[PDB]
Symmetry: C2
Subunit: 292 residues, 2 copies
Amino acid sequence: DTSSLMEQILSNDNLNRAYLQVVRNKGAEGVDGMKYTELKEYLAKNGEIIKEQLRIRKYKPQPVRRVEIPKPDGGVRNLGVPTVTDRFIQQAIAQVLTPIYEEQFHDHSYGFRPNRCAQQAILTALDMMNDGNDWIVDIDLEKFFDTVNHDKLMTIIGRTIKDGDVISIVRKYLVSGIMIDDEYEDSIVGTPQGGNLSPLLANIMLNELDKEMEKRGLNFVRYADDCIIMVGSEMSANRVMRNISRFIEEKLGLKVNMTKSKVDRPRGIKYLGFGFYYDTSAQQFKAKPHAK
Amino acid sequence: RMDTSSLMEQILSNDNLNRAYLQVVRNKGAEGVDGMKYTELKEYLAKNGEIIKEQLRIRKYKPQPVRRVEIPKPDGGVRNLGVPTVTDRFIQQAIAQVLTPIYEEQFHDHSYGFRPNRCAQQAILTALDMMNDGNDWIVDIDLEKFFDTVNHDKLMTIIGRTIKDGDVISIVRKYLVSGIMIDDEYEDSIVGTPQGGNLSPLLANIMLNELDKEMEKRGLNFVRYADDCIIMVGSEMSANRVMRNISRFIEEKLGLKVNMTKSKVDRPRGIKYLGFGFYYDTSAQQFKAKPHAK
Ligand SMILES: [K+]
Ligand SMILES: [K+]
């Protein structure tokens, strides 16, 4: 029964934990200019007003603040920073939804999940490669929150979450522009900015991909919207590339960049900041940070 | 549940030995001093497996010395490995398969090295949370290499508190003398199967678990990966106190060796740990980590 989750989200126990986490996470200000050091006093004054607005679906998230971060290669990393109030509410929601979805998620999904990290994905993939599955299908997706259809995503979420008050606020956060901090691509470890709820939502939809791959008996790892599939031959890899790309676009409504997607051997793959090499003493593929 | 006074027969069971064989073949690796390739182990065991089992039962099995192997590091320089023969990797794995589940239930949640489903990045994440809670004076004790310095009697005494099977104690001690060691390629940010590590890292964790318990008793915030520990403290004064107290415990109680010149108290930006450095992200107002220059 998921029809009455809002009061769990709004319980004093859950909100106190969310507050403490958000202040621990610090982070830049959102569009309202409020610093994380101001949240305590703000909630002392306005917390009951905010809870009331959420209960009646009259709370309006602020748009995320768009920040551009220079990349080492001359590109730009885009971040969407929620206000600290919205980080708090997002964290409160995620604390309740995370345990629900942890029961559904696949063991080879590693991104933005409790006690999981990029290095675990790498080690799982290496074990598959060293078992002979060293033709890699590297499907490149356009940014999840730039391309996902909100109606499709909310429909998937609603298969589990029956509480319409929670559905309503989650949709409003999609509209506000929440997104995935991709600094892990540069081998960075640490708290993502603006990531209390968006990565979970992406994992809910991409769990459908995990289930399709599992139905096909495929060897894969996934970290948010970045998946690699380990296959035993070039011919099979090309078939997998075609079949899974079609599934992603047709069933999930996401966009595959076919130019950036490729079939290659491990030495050609860059994944989660790592490259791969064959250790000729161990007789094993291994991984290490790729040049940036 | 197994009986810790009667573990040798569990180690030597068909099921355990088949699993150990499978894992050693999956791990591949270089040959030891006998020149035996991992693909030759099965035929060797078809002929000699029952002989080896019987030798182990009477404490007459003789481990071969590890082979010293020098290989390139990806970024320059050389890494030195001590490679057991594939037979010894097999027996080591068979022992470890029985000891690991016992010790996994004793170990501390902030120990991350050479343990199932754990990795260096988890240690980094835990440390970053401690740093960002204000514990940004880092006690960085540098230990000389564990297997170059550990006192065998002290180690076997600790093991024997749990493992009451004298035949297991006997073979573990012989593997110490054979030169088993810890592949340190994680220091270069490498992820993948270590060489020569089926038993040695577990033994190091058994001893260093004594340190973890002491640090936990003292309420300290730490992470540890094999013999590489950092401790996160709230002030320089407290860090100097922790440095003094914990270094003394390591040397006096565990008999390990601190390197005076390389142990220090520093802030995160001066720490290199498991291939990572630490930095202050000005936008996030937080410490984060990324691979340090190699
Ligand atoms: K990919
Ligand atoms: K250290």
